[PDB]
């Protein structure tokens, strides 16, 4: 029943603002999962709170400079996630 | 009849080696699919191939170093992949 989610967001944390958008959708993610890299975040929702999710980390990336991809995924859409090298940050 | 692959390559570009390894990384997997972000990859690949695949990624990272997740999901509907902001490299 819960959607599993992979939030991917490619912003430049060089300027102090960029690292700030980080941070936010950082904590919004983590609320509802796990940091697994720097900037991929994976997520579980009920399907009823999706769309409230989507608009929050949406509100918080600079648009015009920024890229937020999501995977919104029925639970058995995952057959394997597979890590390799070192788990840290 | 093939997996739907999500590739996320955490490598710190700071370093010519680093940078070269995001670079060797994206080449193995544009010629399976397509770069969706600085770090992130949508591949297709029969599952006879997969594993040579993982292999091949695997080879080129500093292990001690750097993060490579591969999700291997079944097929998904493009109106489960949701994108906000621009495409910038």
Chains 1, 2 share one sequence.
Do not use: W
């Amino acid at each position: 029943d819960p959607m599993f989610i992979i939030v991917c967001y490619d912003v430049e944390t060089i300027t102090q603002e960029g690292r700030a958008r980080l941070r936010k959708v950082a904590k919004t993610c983590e609320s509802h999962g796990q940091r697994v890299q720097k900037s991929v975040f994976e997520c579980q929702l009920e399907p009823a709170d999706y769309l409230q999710f989507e608009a929050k980390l949406s509100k918080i990336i600079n648009s015009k400079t920024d890229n937020l991809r999501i995977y919104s995924l029925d639970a058995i859409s995952v057959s394997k996630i597979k890590q390799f090298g070192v788990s840290n940050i």
